[PDB]
Design an enzyme around this catalytic site. Sequence first.
Site, PDB file in Angstrom:
ATOM      1  N   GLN A   1    -147.953 -31.111  31.931  1.00 48.08           N
ATOM      2  CA  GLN A   1    -146.563 -31.436  31.611  1.00 48.08           C
ATOM      3  C   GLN A   1    -146.340 -32.683  30.765  1.00 48.08           C
ATOM      4  OE1 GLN A   1    -142.884 -31.141  33.200  1.00 48.08           O
ATOM      5  NE2 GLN A   1    -143.559 -30.389  35.195  1.00 48.08           N
ATOM      6  N   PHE A   2    -146.318 -32.504  29.444  1.00 46.25           N
ATOM      7  CA  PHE A   2    -146.130 -33.612  28.508  1.00 46.25           C
ATOM      8  C   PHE A   2    -144.864 -34.433  28.761  1.00 46.25           C
ATOM      9  CE2 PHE A   2    -143.694 -30.236  26.397  1.00 46.25           C
ATOM     10  CZ  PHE A   2    -142.618 -30.910  25.849  1.00 46.25           C
ATOM     11  N   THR A   3    -143.796 -33.752  29.163  1.00 48.09           N
ATOM     12  CA  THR A   3    -142.521 -34.395  29.441  1.00 48.09           C
ATOM     13  C   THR A   3    -142.681 -35.601  30.363  1.00 48.09           C
ATOM     14  OG1 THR A   3    -142.176 -32.947  31.319  1.00 48.09           O
ATOM     15  CG2 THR A   3    -141.369 -32.220  29.196  1.00 48.09           C
TER      16      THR A   3
END
Lengths: 160, 159
Positions: B88-90
């Site tokens: 999850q880059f976010t």
Amino acid sequence: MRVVIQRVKGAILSVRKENIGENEKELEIISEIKNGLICFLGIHKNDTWEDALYIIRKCLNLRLWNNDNKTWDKNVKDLNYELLIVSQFTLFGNTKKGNKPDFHLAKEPNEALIFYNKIIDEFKKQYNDDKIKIGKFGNYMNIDVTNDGPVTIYIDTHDI
Amino acid sequence: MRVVIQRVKGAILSVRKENIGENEKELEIISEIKNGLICFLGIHKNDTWEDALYIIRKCLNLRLWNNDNKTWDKNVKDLNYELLIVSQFTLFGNTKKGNKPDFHLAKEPNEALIFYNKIIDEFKKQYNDDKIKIGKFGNYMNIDVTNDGPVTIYIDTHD
């Protein structure tokens, strides 16, 4: 003042009351949200109000929804969604000195119980008296979440 | 990198059924676990193997469970529980600037895709591949997680 923000399609929180004798029996729903955000809040040992404020502001203004052609264009308010603020001191539980957490950082109970409520309260003055829900500070809770995306966002109000 | 670990009773990961073959729409399951840990992992642009190696440890090791008159005493491996790791880059969505998160601080899709596998490989190694589960990297997913507690821990390998 740490928080974990998860964009979700829905969320059902529940607690236990007392009297069962089976092996984890008797769960009761006390709140839930359809489309929106769920927030995991932890109160630090020396948090003031300006801290709580940054939280609320962000939780209510991050444009975490793609709308039409554009991406990251709409905030929870715009689309009229809900929010579920949940107390969580686990966050400050330090894990730098061994496999057994160290919450010595956290803010003691009675003192935090008030702060939380104070926030849960302000978390309306800034949006809708009916778009917020809560857990039950100092109580086991069960929470079924529908992660959309998924999307998660972290924020420590001590970084800045 | 950074990781958010939550204690659950189960998790159901689903994706979109991009099937223009004899129909239209719908989402299908792909991975699913019961008691164990859920880990939203964000690969940083400057992440070392040393970094991951850490998360894997603290993950497969932290005592987040209560057993026989003992709180915070057991870990995932002990109770033979499983893990569902999701990239999850976010998690690296910088938010001080504006109200629109810039991830111009999170490692790139592919550079990062392989680093994600390497982690998921080591995990299966450091424990057991039947106990490790994933999703579909970079696609829209629907995760129904049952948060037990809740109990959420966060760690930033950069402290």
